C-alpha cells in the first residue's frame, strides 16, 4: 500500500510505484505523513497535491495510499467538537500536544477511540432479520439534548448476524455484523462518507414548515422555511451577530452547524469564544449550546484544500444528522472566503480563468452546494423525515453585488436577508434593509399560515405596502414638510414609523424581548394594522365637508391608544402566558376601535 | 452616447476613476448650492430669481446624476471587463508556451 | 561614560566565571558526541 | 540633546562588547576542543575505532558502485584495516558490491587532525568525513545546549514548544 | 542533530539564469540549503526549489555569474533553512539572510525554528483585548491598535510611510496605566532609507527593544521572501516562548509581493491576476496570520503591515488582497502631506475594527470611546461645512457652522499634526481631544452621554 | 565622457549600455570626484530586457516584462551615493543618478514607472497638461516628491536659515490653490474669502513668475540658488503681509480687500514679477541681493501706508 516520492516541484509531489490509485484518492506523503490528494495520473506515477508545506520532503520518501477519497468521519463524539475543514479535531490537537500550533502532518483521528459510549440497541432487531441502508439499529446517549442515532451506512444491506448487547462500547469496537451474498461486513459506530458525494434520501420534499427564528423582522416580512436556502450579507457594521445568536440559540431546529471557510484569525476566535458561552432554556434547565452544536473552524492561513473543502465538510456533517430525522441549520460564515479558496486552487492547477478571474465552474459548484439542502424523506424503514437549511453569508470585496460569487449566490438562494450599516449607525437592530430583502417561500408557507393563524397573510401584505408607501412619500415630505400633505398620507407616515419603532425593531439585550413567539409577532402586527385601517376609515368617511376627522384630532384624542400600542412589545412571554398576552392584546384592539368610534 | 468611447486601457481606467471622482464632487457641491438656495427660498416664502436659480441648479445636478455619471460608470465597467479579456488571452498563450516547452523537452530525452 | 565601561567589565567577568564552572563537562560531552560515529544507511534506501 | 545620543551609543556599543566577549569564549572553547581531539588521534587503538566508523558512515552515505578513500599518508596502515572491515559490513547491510580503493598517490594535508574523505569513482562526489568537519558540524547543531550549560538558562523562557 | 557528514557534488547538468541544475544527487530534499564554491574561491548560498529524481534544481541567492559546469562544487547541508533564535538577538540588526551587519557576533542560538512555522490552532486563539499605544495621536485617539490585531498602513508612493514607521518604533509601548519588544523588517529598502532606520533607532536609545531586519533593494530577491518569515519566526519565539508582547512591523509589503512574483517566474508558473501568483492570497495570510493572543500564555503578537498602493489605487491586488484579510486600515493620504501636515493620516477613511475592545475603563480611560466618536463626527461635519463655505461664503454661515470650522482648523493643527519627536501618550491624546471638544457647548456634543460630559467636559 | 547607443543597435549592447555607463561612473567615484550620471531612458533598457526575455523563452510577468525587472533596476539605482573610497588617501567621492522613464501615460501601473518609484528617492514627474500649455519646465508639483528633505535641512539651516520655512509655506500655497481651483471651476469665484483671493493670485504669481522659466535665455539658463530663495522670500513675505492686512482689518470699518491692495501697490506686483529678469553673472551677486532687499523694503512701506 506504499509508493515512493519521485520528485517535488513545490506544493506538488510526484509519486512513483503508485499504480493502484484512484483520482481524488488520499495519500500521506513522507515520514511526517503530509495530507494530500492525487489529481493527475500517468502510468504507475501519480501527481499529488499536498495541502501542507512540503519543505523537507525527499526523493524516495514513502507515500501511503488511503483507499477512501476526501471523506468525513461520522459517529459519536461529533457533537461539541471543533473541526478543521478536512475534519481534524482542533480541541484534541491542542490538548494532546500541549502546543499552540497545529503540527505539520498532524494525524489525530476525527473521533476519539478512548471514549466508552453508552449504546442501547433498538431492541426490535434480531439475528436473522433483514436490514437496509439508513436503518437505525441503536442509539448512543451523548447528552440530554441530542440522541446520536446509529444508522447502517448507505450503500450497504444484508442479513444481521450479530447484534451487540446494550453496554459501553468505544468507536473501535464491533456493534453490528451483517452478511450479504456470503460477504460478512463488520461495522462499528463510525461510518465514513466521501465529502463530495451527496448522501441519498428516499425523496426530496417541498419545504412548508417555517423556520421559527426569534426576530419579528426576518420572520413576519421575510420568512424562511425549514430546508430553505438564504443569504446574509457580511459586513463589519451589519450586525450579523444578531442572526447568528438568535438562530443558534432559540431556533426550532435540532442541530446547529457553524462553518468557517477562511476568515481572519481574530474573527474565528470571536466565534469560538462566543459560542461556548451561549445557553438556552430547554426542559426548564439552562443548557450550553455546544451540546447540540458542531463547529468547523478555518482561518485564512489554513491549507487552501481545507478552506475549499470546509463548506462541503460542513454540509456532509449536516446531512448526517438530517438522515437521523433532525432539522439542521447550517451557517457558512462567508461563502466569499470559500470562493477565494476555490480560485486559488484553480490558479495552482493553471486552469483557464473565467468571470472576474474565478473558475468557469464557480456557478456549478455553488448550485450543487445549495441543492443539497431541503426537506427530505429519510432512508431506512423508520419512515422519518428531516431537513437541512443553509443561511450562508456573502461578503464580496468592496461591498458590490457585481462579484460573480454574490451574483451567483443571489440567483440560487430563495431568501435574501439584506442587512445594512446605516441602520446599525442609527442603533436600529436588527439591521434589516427592508427594501432590498425578499423571500420566495411566501407561497410555500401559505398553507401553514392559513391552517394555523389565518390573518397573518393579509397583515404582512399590508405591512409591506405601508413601509413601501412611506418610502414613496419621502420625496413629497422633503419638498412639503407634511404641510400640503393628505391626512391619509400622514397616517401612513406616522403609522409606518410606529411599525419601524415598536415592531420591526427588536432589542435582544432585554430579557423580555430575547425571543418573540410568532403568536406575539402576529398579535402586535394585527393591532397596528387594525389601527391603520381604523385611522384611514375615520378620515376618509368624514373627509367630505363640515365636520372632518384629521390626524391631529386622532393623535391628540387617543394618545393613550398609541402609547398602549407601543407598550405591546413589553409583554414578556416568560412571565405572561399565551392566554394573558392574547387577552391584553384583545383589550387593546377593543379599546382602539372604541377610541375611533367616539369620533363618529 | 452610452460610453465616452475611450479605448480600453489601464490609462483609461485611471482617467475614468479621476473623472468619476470629479463628477461626484460636482454633484455634491451643486446639491449643497441647491440646498442653500432652497433654504433661503423657503425663508422668503428678488424672489423669481431664486426660483430660476433653483431650477437651473437642480437641472444641472439631475443631469450629472442621470446622464453624466451613469455614462462614466458604464465606461469604467466596460474598460474593466475588456482589460480582463486581454489578460485572459495572455494567460492562454503563456499556458500553451509552457506546454510546448514541456513537449519539446520530452522529445529531447 | 565610566559607568558603562565598569558594568561591561563586570558582565564579561561574570561570563568568564560562569563558563568555567562546568567548562570541562561541556567539553567532555562534545568530545563524546563526535567520537561516537553511529553509522546509518539513509532511511529511503530500498534494496 | 547630543548627550542623549552619546548615552545611546555608549549603551549600544557596551552591549556589543559583552556579546563579542561571549563569542570569544565559545571560539576559545571550540579551539580547545580541537586540541583535545588532536590528543585523541595521537592514540592508535582508539583512533582506529574512529576510522572504522568514519569509513563505514562515508560509504553508506555515498552508495556508489566505486569509491576512493583519501587519507593522511601516516594514517594509511589504519585506514587500510578500516576499509577491509568496512567492505564486508557494507555489502551485508546494503546488498551492493562496491569496489572501494584507497588513493595512494594523493593524500590529505598533514595539518588535519585526522579522518578521511570519500570520493566516488569519477571523483565528482566527495564526502566531507574528516574529523575537523564532523566536529564543526556537531558543535553547531548542539550549540543551543552549549549556551545554556556555560552561561545559564534563559530565565524569561517559560515554554519550550 | 543529524551528525551525518555532508556530501559535496561537482556534477552540474546546467545553469539557467538564477537556477543551477545539478545531477547525481543522493536523496535530495525540497527546500534544502546548499552552499556553492566557485573556481575563484567565492562562496554562494542557495536553496533547492525542485527535486526531480536525481536532478536537483537549486536557486542561487547571489548572482550565478562565474559558475561553470565543470569545477563548481555544491555542498548539501542535509536540512532546510532553520533560523537560530534567542532573546539576546533583540537589540541586534540583521540582513535578510539572518546574518549580523552591526559588527556584532553571530547569534548564539537558544533554538532553531523552521521559518515557515505552522498555523496557530484556532481553538487556542484569544480574542484581542488591551491596547498598545503608538504615541501618534491620529492612531491612538481615533483608530487604536488592539493588543492582538493586524492593522496595515496603506500609503501612496512618495508619502512618509517610512518616517511614521520609524516613529512608531521609537514611541510605541504599553499604556502603563519591560515586557515589550518590536521586531521591524524592511523589504526592498534602498540604501538611504536603510541607513535612516538603523541610525534613527540606535541614536534614540530604542534599539534595546528592537530587532531590526534590513533587506536592501539590491539584495537577493529570494532573501526578501524569507526576511518577513525570519522576523515573525523571531516574534513567535519572543512572544509565545518568552512571555512578552511583540509588535511586528512589516515595511513595504509591496516590495515583497514583487519579489514573490520573481520567484514564481523562476518556477515557470503561469502568472495570475495582474501578473501575481494565484497563491498570493494564501502567501499573505501565511505571513499575516502568525499573530494574535494564545490561551494560557501572557505574550502576544500584533502586526502593522505597511503597503505602497501602486498608482494610488486601493483596488490593486496588493492592498486589496491585504485588506481583505486584515482588521481595518490606517490609510496615509496625499492631500494632508501636500498641506505639510505630519503625520498625514486621514481619519475619515481609516478604521480599526477592534478599537471597541481596545479602549475603555481598565484598559485606557473611561471616556476614550466617547471622545473618539464625537471627534470623528466633528471632523466629518467640519469637512462638510468647509465644502459649504466654499460655495455660500463666510457671511452665509451660522454660529454652529463657524464652530465646526474652528474645530476643523484646530483639529488638524493640534490633534493630527504632531511632529516626529513628540510622543503623545493615550492620556495626553484624549486630553487634547477634550480641549478641542470644549469648543462646542455641551448640547452640541450629541454622541457623548451626559454622565461622561459632567465628569470630563468642564475644566 | 558620454556613451552613445542608438535604437538600431543590437539588444545586447542596448542592455549593456547602462552597465558600461555606471562602471565608468564608479571608476571616477573612486577618485574622490563628484560624478553625475544622466540616463536618457530606462524604459529602453527595460525594453531590451523584455526583448531578450522573450527570445530566451523564459516565463514573463506583467506586460511581457521579466519578473526580475525590479531587481535589474534596483541593482543599477543602488550603485550610487556619497561614499568613503577605498585607498590610503581617505578621499570621499559620490555618484548621483538621474534616471529617465519614458511615460506611455500618467498611469504609474507602468511596470517600469512602478519599479522605479519603489527605488528612487526623488521623482520629478512631468505633467502632460502643463506641457500642452507650454509651461516650462513642466512639473506636476502635486505627484512629485523628494525624500531628502530632512537630509538637507542641516545644510539649509546652516547657510540660509530662511529656505526651510519658505519651502513649507510655498508647498502650502500651491496645494491650497489646487483645492480652490476645483471650486472656482464650479462656482466662478462667486463667493471667495479675501484670504482665498490672495492665495489664488500669489499662487499664480508663483506659477508664472517663479516656477516658469525659459532655459534658453541668458537670465534663466541657470538660476543660482541664492537667487531662487531670494525670489521666493519676497513672494512669501508679500503673501503674509497681504494676508495679515485683510484679516487684521476684517469685521471693521476700513476693511482691506484684494482690489484695494492690487490698486494700492500695483507697482510692487510688477517688481515681484520682474525678479526673473535680474540676469545673474551679467549682473553681480551683491547687487541682485541688494535689489531684492529693496523690494522687501518697498513692500513693507506699501503695506504700512495702506494700514
Swiss-Prot record, chain D:
One of its GO terms (biological process) is proton transmembrane transport. The keyword Cell membrane applies. Keywords: Acetylation, Cell membrane, Cytoplasmic vesicle, Hydrogen ion transport, Ion transport, Membrane, Phosphoprotein, Synapse, Transport. The keyword Transport applies. Disulfide bonds: none annotated. It is found in: Apical cell membrane; Cytoplasmic vesicle, Secretory vesicle, Synaptic vesicle membrane; Cytoplasmic vesicle, Clathrin-coated vesicle membrane. GO terms for molecular function: ATPase binding; proton-transporting ATPase activity, rotational mechanism. Expressed in brain (at protein level). GO terms for cellular component: apical plasma membrane; clathrin-coated vesicle membrane; cytoplasm; cytosol; endosome; extrinsic component of synaptic vesicle membrane; microvillus; vacuolar proton-transporting V-type ATPase, V1 domain. It is a peripheral membrane protein. Subunit of the V1 complex of vacuolar(H+)-ATPase (V-ATPase), a multisubunit enzyme composed of a peripheral complex (V1) that hydrolyzes ATP and a membrane integral complex (V0) that translocates protons. V-ATPase is responsible for acidifying and maintaining the pH of intracellular compartments and in some cell types, is targeted to the plasma membrane, where it is responsible for acidifying the extracellular environment. V-ATPase is a heteromultimeric enzyme made up of two complexes: the ATP-hydrolytic V1 complex and the proton translocation V0 complex. The V1 complex consists of three catalytic AB heterodimers that form a heterohexamer, three peripheral stalks each consisting of EG heterodimers, one central rotor including subunits D and F, and the regulatory subunits C and H. The proton translocation complex V0 consists of the proton transport subunit a, a ring of proteolipid subunits c9c'', rotary subunit d, subunits e and f, and the accessory subunits ATP6AP1/Ac45 and ATP6AP2/PRR. Belongs to the V-ATPase E subunit family. This is V-type proton ATPase subunit E 1. It comes from Rattus norvegicus (Rat). The gene is Atp6v1e1. The chain holds residues 66 to 226 of 226 of the full protein.
UniProtKB/Swiss-Prot annotation, chain E:
It is a peripheral membrane protein. GO terms for biological process: ATP metabolic process; regulation of cellular pH; synaptic vesicle lumen acidification; vacuolar acidification. This is V-type proton ATPase subunit B, brain isoform. It is found in: Apical cell membrane; Melanosome; Cytoplasm; Cytoplasmic vesicle, Secretory vesicle, Synaptic vesicle membrane. The gene is Atp6v1b2. V-ATPase is a heteromultimeric enzyme made up of two complexes: the ATP-hydrolytic V1 complex and the proton translocation V0 complex. The V1 complex consists of three catalytic AB heterodimers that form a heterohexamer, three peripheral stalks each consisting of EG heterodimers, one central rotor including subunits D and F, and the regulatory subunits C and H. The proton translocation complex V0 consists of the proton transport subunit a, a ring of proteolipid subunits c9c'', rotary subunit d, subunits e and f, and the accessory subunits ATP6AP1/Ac45 and ATP6AP2/PRR. SUPFAM superfamilies: P-loop containing nucleoside triphosphate hydrolases. One of its GO terms (molecular function) is proton-transporting ATPase activity, rotational mechanism. The lineage of its organism: Eukaryota, Metazoa, Chordata, Craniata, Vertebrata.
Amino acid at each position: 500500500t506504499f509508493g515512493y516520492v519521485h520528485g517535488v516541484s513545490g506544493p506538488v509531489v510526484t509519486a512513483c510505484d503508485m499504480a493502484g490509485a484512484a483520482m481524488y484518492e488520499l495519500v500521506r506523503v513522507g515520514h511526517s505523513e503530509l495530507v494530500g490528494e492525487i489529481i493527475r495520473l500517468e502510468g504507475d506515477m501519480a501527481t499529488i497535491q499536498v495541502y501542507e508545506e512540503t519543505s523537507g520532503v525527499s526523493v524516495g520518501d514513502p507515500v501511503l495510499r488511503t483507499g477512501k477519497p476526501l471523506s468525513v468521519e461520522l459517529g459519536p463524539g461529533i457533537m461539541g467538537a471543533i473541526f478543521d475543514g478536512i475534519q481534524r479535531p482542533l480541541s484534541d490537537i491542542s490538548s494532546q500536544t500541549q502546543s499552540i500550533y497545529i503540527p505539520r502532518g498532524v494525524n489525530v483521528s476525527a473521533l476519539s477511540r478512548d471514549i466508552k459510549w453508552e449504546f442501547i440497541p433498538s431492541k426490535n432487531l434480531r439475528v436473522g432479520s433483514h436490514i437496509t441502508g439508513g436503518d437505525i439499529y441503536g442509539i448512543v446517549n451523548e447528552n440530554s439534548l441530542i440522541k446520536h442515532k446509529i444508522m447502517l451506512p448507505p450503500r450497504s444491506r444484508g442479513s444481521v448476524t450479530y447484534i451487540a448487547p446494550p453496554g459501553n462500547y468505544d468507536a473501535s469496537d464491533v456493534v453490528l455484523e451483517l452478511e450479504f451474498e456470503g460477504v460478512k461486513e463488520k461495522l462499528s459506530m463510525v461510518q465514513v462518507w466521501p465529502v463530495r458525494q451527496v448522501r441519498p434520501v428516499t425523496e426530496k420534499l417541498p419545504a412548508n414548515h417555517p423556520l421559527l427564528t426569534g426576530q419579528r423582522v426576518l420572520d413576519a416580512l421575510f420568512p424562511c422555511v425549514q430546508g430553505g436556502t438564504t443569504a446574509i450579507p457580511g459586513a463589519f457594521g451589519c450586525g450579523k451577530t444578531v442572526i447568528s445568536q438568535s438562530l443558534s440559540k432559540y431556533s426550532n431546529s435540532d442541530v446547529i452547524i457553524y462553518v468557517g471557510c477562511g476568515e481572519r484569525g481574530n474573527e474565528m476566535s470571536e466565534v469560538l469564544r462566543d459560542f461556548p458561552e451561549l445557553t438556552m432554556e430547554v426542559d426548564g434547565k439552562v443548557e450550553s449550546i455546544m451540546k447540540r452544536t458542531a463547529l468547523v473552524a478555518n482561518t485564512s492561513n489554513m491549507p487552501v484544500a481545507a478552506r475549499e473543502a470546509s463548506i462541503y465538510t460542513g454540509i456532509t456533517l449536516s446531512e448526517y444528522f438530517r438522515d437521523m430525522g433532525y432539522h439542521v441549520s447550517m451557517m457558512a460564515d462567508s461563502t466569499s472566503r470559500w470562493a477565494e479558496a476555490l480560485r486559488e486552487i484553480s490558479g495552482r492547477l493553471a486552469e483557464m480563468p473565467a468571470d472576474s478571474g474565478y473558475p468557469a465552474y464557480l456557478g456549478a459548484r455553488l448550485a450543487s452546494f445549495y441543492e443539497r439542502a431541503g426537506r427530505v424523506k429519510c432512508l431506512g424503514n423508520p419512515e422519518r423525515e428531516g431537513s437541512v437549511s443553509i443561511v450562508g453569508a456573502v461578503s464580496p470585496p468592496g461591498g458590490d453585488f457585481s462579484d460573480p460569487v454574490t451574483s451567483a449566490t443571489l440567483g440560487i438562494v430563495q431568501v435574501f436577508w439584506g442587512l445594512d450599516k446605516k441602520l446599525a449607525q442609527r442603533k436600529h437592530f436588527p439591521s434589516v434593509n427592508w427594501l432590498i430583502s425578499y423571500s420566495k417561500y411566501m407561497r410555500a408557507l401559505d398553507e401553514y399560515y392559513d391552517k394555523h393563524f389565518t390573518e397573518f397573510v393579509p397583515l404582512r401584505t399590508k405591512a409591506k405596502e405601508i413601509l413601501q408607501e412611506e418610502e414613496d412619500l419621502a420625496e413629497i415630505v422633503q419638498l412639503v414638510g407634511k404641510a400640503s400633505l393628505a391626512e391619509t398620507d400622514k397616517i401612513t407616515l406616522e403609522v409606518a414609523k410606529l411599525i419601524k419603532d415598536d415592531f420591526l425593531q427588536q432589542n435582544g439585550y432585554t430579557p423580555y424581548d430575547r425571543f418573540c413567539p410568532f403568536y406575539k409577532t402576529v398579535g402586535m402586527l394585527s393591532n397596528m394594522i387594525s389601527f391603520y385601517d381604523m385611522a384611514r376609515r375615520a378620515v376618509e368617511t368624514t373627509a367630505q365637508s363640515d365636520n372632518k376627522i384629521t390626524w391631529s384630532i386622532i393623535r391628540e384624542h387617543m394618545g393613550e391608544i398609541l402609547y398602549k400600542l407601543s407598550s405591546m412589545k413589553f409583554k414578556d412571554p416568560v412571565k405572561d402566558g399565551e392566554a394573558k398576552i392574547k387577552a391584553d392584546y384583545a383589550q387593546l384592539l377593543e379599546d382602539m376601535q372604541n377610541a375611533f368610534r367616539s369620533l363618529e | 452616447k452610452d460610453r465616452i468611447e475611450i479605448f480600453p486601457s489601464r490609462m483609461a481606467q485611471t482617467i475614468m476613476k479621476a473623472r468619476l471622482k470629479g463628477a461626484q464632487t460636482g454633484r455634491n457641491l451643486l446639491k449643497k448650492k441647491s440646498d442653500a438656495l432652497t433654504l433661503r427660498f423657503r425663508q422668503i416664502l428678488s424672489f423669481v430669481t431664486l426660483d430660476e436659480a433653483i431650477k437651473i441648479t437642480n437641472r444641472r445636478v439631475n443631469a450629472i446624476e442621470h446622464v453624466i455619471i451613469p455614462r462614466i460608470e458604464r465606461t469604467l465597467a466596460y474598460i474593466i471587463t475588456e482589460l480582463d479579456e486581454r489578460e485572459r488571452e495572455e494567460f492562454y498563450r503563456l499556458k500553451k508556451i509552457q506546454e510546448k516547452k514541456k513537449i519539446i523537452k520530452e522529445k529531447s530525452e | 561614560s565610566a559607568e558603562v565601561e565598569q558594568a561591561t567589565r563586570r558582565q564579561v567577568q561574570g561570563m568568564q566565571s560562569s563558563q568555567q564552572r562546568n567548562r570541562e563537562r561541556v567539553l567532555t560531552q562534545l568530545l563524546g558526541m563526535v567520537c561516537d560515529v553511529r553509522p546509518q544507511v539513509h532511511p529511503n534506501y530500498r534494496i | 540633546q547630543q548627550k542623549k545620543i552619546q548615552m545611546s551609543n555608549l549603551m549600544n556599543q557596551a552591549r556589543l562588547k559583552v556579546l563579542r566577549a561571549r563569542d570569544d569564549l565559545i571560539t576559545d572553547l571550540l579551539n580547545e576542543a580541537k586540541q583535545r581531539l588532536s590528543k585523541v588521534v595521537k592514540d592508535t587503538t582508539r583512533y582506529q575505532v574512529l576510522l572504522d566508523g568514519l569509513v563505514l558512515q562515508g560509504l553508506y552515505q555515498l552508495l556508489e558502485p566505486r569509491m576512493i578513500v583519501r587519507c593522511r599518508k601516516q594514517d594509511f596502515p589504519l585506514v587500510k584495516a578500516a576499509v577491509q572491515k568496512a567492505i564486508p559490513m557494507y555489502k551485508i547491510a546494503t546488498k551492493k558490491d562496491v569496489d572501494v580503493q584507497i588513493d595512494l598517490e594523493a593524500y590529505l594535508p598533514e595539518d588535519i587532525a585526522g579522518g578521511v574523505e570519500i570520493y566516488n569513482g569519477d571523483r565528482k562526489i566527495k564526502v566531507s568525513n574528516t574529523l575537523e568537519s564532523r566536529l564543526d558540524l556537531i558543535a553547531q547543531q548542539m550549540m543551543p545546549e552549549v549556551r545554556g550549560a556555560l552561561f545559564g538558562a534563559n530565565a524569561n523562557r517559560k515554554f519550550l514548544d | 542533530y543529524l551528525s551525518q557528514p555532508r556530501l559535496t557534488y561537482k556534477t552540474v547538468s546546467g545553469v539557467n539564469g538564477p537556477l543551477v541544475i545539478l545531477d547525481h544527487v543522493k536523496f535530495p530534499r525540497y527546500a534544502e540549503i546548499v552552499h556553492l564554491t566557485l573556481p575563484d574561491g567565492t562562496k554562494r548560498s542557495g536553496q533547492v526549489l525542485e527535486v526531480s529524481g536525481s536532478k536537483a534544481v537549486v536557486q542561487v541567492f547571489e548572482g550565478t555569474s562565474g559558475i561553470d559546469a565543470k569545477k563548481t562544487s555544491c555542498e548539501f547541508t542535509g536540512d532546510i533553512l532553520r533560523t537560530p533564535v534567542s532573546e539576546d538577538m533583540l537589540g541586534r540588526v540583521f540582513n535578510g539572510s539572518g546574518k549580523p551587519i552591526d559588527r556584532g557576533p553571530v547569534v548564539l542560538a537558544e533554538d532553531f525554528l523552521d521559518i515557515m512555522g505552522q498555523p496557530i490552532n484556532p481553538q487556542c486563539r484569544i480574542y484581542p483585548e488591551e491596547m498598545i499605544q503608538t504615541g501618534i495621536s491620529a492612531i491612538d485617539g481615533m483608530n487604536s491598535i488592539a493588543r492582538g490585531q493586524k492593522i496595515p498602513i496603506f500609503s501612496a508612493a512618495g508619502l512618509p510611510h517610512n518616517e511614521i514607521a520609524a516613529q512608531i518604533c521609537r514611541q510605541a509601548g504599553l499604556v502603563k496605566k519591560e515586557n515589550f519588544a518590536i521586531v521591524f523588517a524592511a523589504m526592498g529598502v534602498n540604501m538611504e532609507t536603510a541607513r535612516f532606520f538603523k541610525s534613527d533607532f540606535e541614536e534614540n536609545g530604542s534599539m534595546d527593544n528592537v530587532c531590526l531586519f534590513l533587506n536592501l533593494a539590491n539584495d537577493p530577491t529570494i532573501e526578501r521572501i524569507i526576511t518577513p518569515r525570519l522576523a515573525l519566526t523571531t516574534a513567535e519565539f519572543l512572544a509565545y516562548q518568552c512571555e512578552k508582547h511583540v509588535l511586528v512591523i512589516l515595511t513595504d509589503m509591496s516590495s515583497y509581493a514583487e519579489a514573490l512574483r520573481e520567484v514564481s517566474a523562476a518556477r515557470e508558473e503561469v502568472p495570475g491576476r495582474r501578473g501575481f501568483p494565484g497563491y498570493m492570497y494564501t502567501d499573505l495570510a501565511t505571513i499575516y496570520e502568525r499573530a494574535g493572543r494564545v490561551e494560557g500564555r501572557n505574550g502576544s503578537i500584533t502586526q502593522i503591515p505597511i503597503l505602497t498602493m501602486p498608482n494610488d489605487d486601493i483596488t490593486h491586488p496588493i492592498p486589496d488582497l491585504t485588506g481583505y484579510i486584515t482588521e481595518g486600515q490606517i490609510y496615509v493620504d496625499r492631500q494632508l502631506h501636500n498641506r505639510q501636515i505630519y503625520p498625514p493620516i486621514n481619519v475619515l477613511p481609516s478604521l480599526s475594527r477592534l478599537m471597541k475592545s481596545a479602549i475603555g475603563e481598565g484598559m485606557t480611560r473611561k471616556d476614550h470611546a466617547d471622545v473618539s466618536n464625537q471627534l470623528y463626527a466633528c471632523y466629518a461635519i467640519g469637512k462638510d461645512v468647509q465644502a459649504m463655505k466654499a460655495v455660500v461664503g463666510e457671511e452665509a454661515l451660522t454660529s454652529d457652522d463657524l464652530l465646526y470650522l474652528e474645530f476643523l482648523q484646530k483639529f488638524e493643527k493640534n490633534f493630527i499634526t504632531q511632529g516626529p519627536y513628540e510622543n503623545r501618550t493615550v492620556y495626553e491624546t484624549l486630553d487634547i481631544g477634550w480641549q478641542l471638544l470644549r469648543i462646542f457647548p455641551k448640547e452640541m456634543l450629541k454622541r457623548i452621554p451626559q454622565s461622561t460630559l459632567s465628569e470630563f467636559y468642564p475644566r
